[PDB]
Design a protein around this ligand. Structure first.
Ligand code: HEM
Ligand code: HEM
Ligand code: HEM
Ligand code: HEM
Lengths: 146, 141, 141, 146
């Protein structure tokens, strides 16, 4: 992929103001609540019975944080995303057997979470810079297929 | 489908929007054209640059239809059957674009009303947008 | 949705299948596990190798539900509401898998009844399979 | 992608018995009839009013043939699919603006058309060998994105 200069600036800037823990937790909690079938891959997390339980589950918060920290790694090597996520592609695909359409859903939720944490600072051009990021990361993960 | 609970959430978030509906309809269209460029293909006759009196004029129309499907959430299919032919038959809009518009509308209400778009409400709103999307592409399946 | 014409096509192709329904239900499941390996994840308790008395036993069940939704094509939602909870609630089947099963079922009727799966009928059958898919994942939206 | 030895044999064998013209025409005619919104990209083809018209349209048949001939090129360079389709990726993406989900639909229809032309000779392992092909070609086309 080709990363325009503004895009990098837009991606990097915003990223530095991101609360990895609160956002990661919220993004993953929403995934599970809005698209319930995703709960299937997290049985080892314990109680996900109600949304209030998913919201409080210590491991959801704990995992959400790791997921967003992972995006950070992509934000540090925009030109090297394919490799940064090679091992994760094996885990999601070969180990867990997640369908790539779900990688797309999480990225879309992340975008909505970011939008709610930055308000107007999240300009249309910014949204577009992030959609793109969210996309390439999703392909980078679904590499280990076709 | 749309649970009595879901219907409540949708109406709730639509009442906190109320007057701004129109402004939100234009912002959603602007983000769509910016984040999903391929959608500009359907508006070759529009001035697609930010601000255009057309994008605003249209954004009003889109928002109005939403506000009107919300008042008939018990029968969204009938309160929009007219728009189905336009979208599915004449325009032949690829079904995917509907997901895009919906996603941009959420990004909007989330920028203006974060504390209202709670994960439980998000879930409802997304079901509601999917319904509309379905009804408007109905002449396909 | 399912036009009076569509309903006719579905019933038509299901009458030419009739007795073989069961055999076809097992072949469709075998192709799914072979072409879409990731679906084997939902059947850890099955003997997934070609021939298994379970895959055949299950293939019967799947075909039976189809044949039964065809007789209530006017109300598919009610003739399968029972299977919805199992698929959406307990099993938590990712919606995409439904597209897979449907595609394999077509590949089947196309191998055994090419001259029956005319492009117009294909169109109908695909709408019918989508409905079933929808009703079985209903407890999602 | 990694092409097993059986897969190549399975892909190449069947391919030699394919009627490029009849199949290509049928596959594209079905695409337009089952997923009507695709008709949008073919306005320059003239009359697509009814299925019987789409079935008879000289340019649909004429184009269907070119599409399957294209798959042939992929069948000749299984290890070089990414490149073979570089220029086509520009046309579908940058020029026509087709959504990759539609590349996936055509491949799925092709699979159904092949199934109807070969009957039982189209074994499950064969279907799987072709799904894979249809997939990589689809990604090869949607390369010019992310
Ligand atoms: C598209 C963005 C995604 C990213 C960047 C991502 C990232 C990660 C990372 C970095 C780990 C943690 C590695 C570890 O500590 O072992 C992980 C684990 C995992 N991911 Fe993802 N993931 C993504 C999407 C998904 C989705 C969509 C699902 C399924 C709905 C999923 C399911 C899992 C599961 C269940 C685990 C391991 C659970 C465990 O170790 O107990 N991931 N993911
Ligand atoms: C839930 C979303 C949508 C709603 C509520 C909606 C609503 C409307 C309304 C009210 C009109 C008709 C207004 C009139 O009679 O002039 C309209 C027109 C139209 N819509 Fe949609 N629409 C939706 C999605 C889409 C999408 C996704 C596209 C394609 C990217 C689209 C493209 C168009 C076009 C091209 C027109 C014509 C406008 C003109 O020529 O001025 N719509 N839509
Ligand atoms: C249109 C397609 C489908 C139909 C008509 C259907 C129908 C059925 C029926 C009749 C049963 C319940 C039988 C019983 O009470 O024991 C069943 C069970 C089940 N279904 Fe589905 N199903 C469909 C799709 C799927 C898909 C796509 C998957 C997932 C890849 C799936 C996975 C299961 C599982 C795991 C069971 C349990 C079987 C067992 O434990 O023995 N089904 N399905
Ligand atoms: C996934 C497999 C696909 C392959 C291999 C493929 C292949 C081709 C090839 C080789 C050409 C002919 C080049 C020429 O003569 O100029 C072409 C042109 C084109 N394709 Fe595709 N295509 C695919 C999917 C699609 C889909 C899904 C659509 C849209 C529903 C589409 C729309 C078009 C259009 C409209 C043209 C040019 C029309 C014209 O020149 O008049 N293609 N494609």
């Amino acid at each position: 992929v080709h990363w325009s200069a503004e895009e990098k600036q837009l991606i990097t800037g915003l990223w530095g103001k991101v609360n990895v823990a609160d956002c990661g937790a919220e993004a993953l909690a929403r995934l599970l609540i809005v698209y319930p079938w995703t709960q299937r891959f997290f049985s080892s997390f314990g109680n996900l019975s109600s949304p209030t339980a998913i919201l409080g589950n210590p491991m959801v918060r704990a995992h959400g944080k790791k997921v967003l920290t992972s995006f950070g790694d992509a934000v540090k090597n925009l030109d090297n995303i394919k490799n940064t996520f090679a091992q994760l592609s094996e885990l999601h695909c070969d180990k867990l057997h997640v369908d790539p359409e779900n990688f797309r859903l999480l990225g879309d939720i992340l975008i909505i979470v970011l939008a709610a944490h930055f308000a107007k600072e999240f300009t249309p051009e910014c949204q577009a810079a992030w959609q793109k990021l969210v996309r390439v990361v999703a392909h980078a993960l679904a590499r280990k297929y076709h | 489908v749309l649970s009595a609970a879901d219907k409540t959430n949708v109406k709730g978030v639509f009442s906190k929007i109320g007057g701004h509906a129109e402004e939100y309809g234009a912002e959603t269209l602007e983000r769509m054209f910016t984040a999903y460029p391929q959608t500009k293909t359907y508006f070759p006759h529009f001035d697609l640059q930010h601000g255009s009196a057309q994008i605003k004029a249209h954004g009003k129309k889109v928002a109005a239809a939403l506000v009107e499907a919300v008042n008939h959430i018990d029968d969204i299919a009938g309160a929009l059957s007219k728009l189905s032919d336009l979208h599915a038959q004449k325009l032949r809009v690829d079904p995917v674009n509907f997901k895009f518009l919906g996603h941009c509308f959420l990004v909007v209400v989330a920028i203006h009303h974060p504390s209202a778009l709670t994960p439980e409400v998000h879930a409802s709103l997304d079901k509601f947008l999917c319904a509309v999307g379905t009804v408007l592409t109905a002449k396909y399946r």
